[PDB]
């Protein structure tokens, strides 16, 4: 269950490590004055449509599976 | 109760759907509606069907526009090999 909080603050964190980190913080508010992958996946409506159309396969399959 | 799907094909007139508009969306899905008026002296499309082949010619409220392409399209599936 914890791989998916450790993964998530490892993407979420800078590239650089604590010792060269300080770069990375002035950066951060440099651009102060002015996610496609990792947490969600954006599709188009094709796809959301094959995606709906396998889901309700999948439960009606196992609605048969279970009462038989 | 089982699996798999049946090829039902339905030919029928186009004069007698309850809702001849509702379906002229090309290439789009169109709901349908199965509930059924006694007082539309129509009739609604028959569910769990795979296919349709709408048939008009022209009228509105009278059948005899599928029996002759009906037949001849089971003559020309007959003498596929």
């Not at chain 1, 102060?32 to 599709?43: A, N, S, T």
Request: charged share 25%; hydrophobic share 35%.
């Amino acid at each position: 269950f914890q791989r998916y909080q450790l993964i998530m603050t490892f993407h979420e964190r800078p590239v650089l490590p604590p010792p060269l980190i300080i770069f990375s913080h002035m950066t951060m508010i440099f651009q102060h004055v002015c996610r496609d992958y990792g947490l969600k996946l954006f599709i188009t409506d094709d796809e959301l449509k094959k995606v709906h159309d396998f889901e309700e396969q999948c439960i009606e399959e196992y609605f048969r599976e279970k009462d038989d | 109760k089982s699996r798999g799907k049946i090829c039902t094909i339905g030919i029928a007139p186009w004069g007698i759907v309850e809702n001849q508009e509702d379906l002229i969306g090309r290439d789009v899905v169109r709901p349908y509606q199965t509930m059924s008026n006694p007082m539309s002296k129509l009739t609604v499309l028959n569910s769990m069907h795979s296919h349709f082949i709408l048939a008009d010619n022209g009228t509105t409220g009278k059948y005899g526009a599928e029996v002759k392409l009906r037949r001849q399209l089971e003559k020309h599936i007959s003498l596929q090999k």
